[PDB]
């Protein structure tokens, strides 16, 4: 959300993100391919 | 005011393979985590479907709940609430 919180030290590289939505909606933007 | 509960949030729709070093990890991401507690059924030994997490940071909260509500982890969307959660140990 664009916060400048430093992440914690427990975190490894994993990347939970919202917006998952708006990527799927990104790429089903065609009209003829897949959706 | 750092010295709120607000700090403390409510994490239901936990799936029965996730404990404390799952959440943890992701939980860092939106910030510092201090405690975690899974709450997990004696009788099963699994999680009983919802955990509690606290921050160092309030912000760290919020952006834990807004990015992690609705966020499908292990097949199912997991939720997120605010809520002030005092630990029995």
């Not at chain 2, 943890?24 to 955990?51: H, K, M």
């Amino acid at each position: 959300n664009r916060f400048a919180i430093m992440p914690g030290s427990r975190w490894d590289g994993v990347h939970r993100s919202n917006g998952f939505e708006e990527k799927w909606f990104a790429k089903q933007n065609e009209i003829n391919e897949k959706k | 005011n750092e010295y709120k509960d607000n700090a403390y949030i409510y994490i239901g729709n936990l799936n029965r393979e996730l404990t404390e070093g799952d959440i943890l990890t992701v939980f860092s991401e939106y910030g510092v985590p201090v405690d975690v507690i899974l709450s997990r059924d004696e009788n099963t030994g699994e999680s009983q479907g919802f955990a509690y997490l606290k921050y160092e940071d309030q912000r760290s909260t919020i952006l834990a709940v807004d990015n992690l509500n609705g966020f499908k982890i292990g097949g199912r969307a997991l939720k997120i609430d605010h809520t002030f959660y005092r630990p029995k140990r």
